[PDB]
Amino acid sequence: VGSLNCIVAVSQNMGIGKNGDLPWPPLRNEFRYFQRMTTTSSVEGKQNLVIMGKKTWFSIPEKNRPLKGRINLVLSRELKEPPQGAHFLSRSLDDALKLTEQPELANKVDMVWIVGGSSVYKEAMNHPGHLKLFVTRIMQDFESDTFFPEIDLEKYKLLPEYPGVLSDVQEEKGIKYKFEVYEKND
Numbered sequence: 001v002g003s004l005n006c007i008v009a010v011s012q013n014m015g016i017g018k019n020g021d022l023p024w025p026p027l028r029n030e031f032r033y034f035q036r037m038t039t040t041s042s043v044e045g046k047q048n049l050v051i052m053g054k055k056t057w058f059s060i061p062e063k064n065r066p067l068k069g070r071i072n073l074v075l076s077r078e079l080k081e082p083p084q085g086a087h088f089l090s091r092s093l094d095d096a097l098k099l100t101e102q103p104e105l106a107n108k109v110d111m112v113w114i115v116g117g118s119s120v121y122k123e124a125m126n127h128p129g130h131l132k133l134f135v136t137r138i139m140q141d142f143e144s145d146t147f148f149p150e151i152d153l154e155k156y157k158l159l160p161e162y163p164g165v166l167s168d169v170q171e172e173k174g175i176k177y178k179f180e181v182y183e184k185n186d
């Protein structure tokens with residue numbers, strides 16, 4: 001279909017979260033991009049699937065829930081039913097994908113995106129396969145409580161250029177960030 005894409009925004013300090021929210025002021029072009037990648041499908045007829053954790057689902061305003069133009073999928077080991085507005089519940093990343101394969105998720109599912117969080121990016125990586133890491137490098141410190149799982153990066157390729165990805169350092173709201181994409185076929 002599509003390959004395990006991971007999409008994360010990192011602060012220099014390796015922070016991704018802080019009290020169920022973002023280590024930084026919301027940055028709208030970074031949001032538009034995020035929207036861009038995860039929704040956008042070439043196969044016709046098919047949606048992308050975004051796999052996300054309990055605390056990530058919840059950070060996202062009710063208002064944009066479930067994310068417009070993507071099958072929303074939630075990972076929790078505690079709810080019984082999936083959070084409202086949210087399309088599936090899956091106790092673990094191995095079954096999230098089994099489901100894809102399952103009967104109706106089959107013809108529909110085009111790519112699958114890992115929006116996070118921590119143990120989800122944690123399950124991801126540690127998979128043998130075609131994984132591309134879409135990394136947004138917020139080039140500032142923000143005190144955060146939740147962090148990026150570190151990637152043995154001698155095992156990834158840093159593509160200099162990616163299809164539709166800005167390659168020069170971007171500056172919104174006095175903040176400065178840059179996009180890099182990583183690969184691995186292990």
Ligand SMILES: NC(=O)C1=CN([C@@H]2O[C@H](COP(=O)(O)OP(=O)(O)OC[C@H]3O[C@@H](n4cnc5c(N)ncnc54)[C@H](OP(=O)(O)O)[C@@H]3O)[C@@H](O)[C@H]2O)C=CC1
Nearest residue numbers: 009016017018021053054055056059076077116117118119
């Ligand atoms: N800035 C960015 O790019 C990103 C920021 N964020 C932010 O970072 C923080 C997210 O907090 P974090 O603790 O990472 O929480 P997550 O939202 O990733 O947690 C999802 C919940 O789901 C469960 N879960 C997670 N991984 C798995 C798994 N592999 N199998 C089953 N259940 C799983 C855990 O809950 P249970 O007890 O249900 O198992 C966890 O509580 C918030 O600040 C959020 O806004 C998140 C993603 C990207």
Ligand SMILES: Nc1nc(N)c2nc(CNc3ccc(C(=O)N[C@@H](CCCNC(=O)c4ccccc4C(=O)O)C(=O)O)cc3)cnc2n1
Nearest residue numbers: 007008009028029031032034035059060064068115116136
């Ligand atoms: N790289 C990258 N990777 C990630 N995994 C990632 N994860 C998060 C996780 N926490 C959230 C919180 C909110 C939303 C959300 O709300 N989602 C909308 C975006 C619409 C844009 N909304 C705006 O910011 C906005 C608001 C008003 C006017 C203009 C805009 C705009 O985007 O220009 C959508 O459809 O995807 C998503 C994730 C945050 N940042 C990330 N960055």
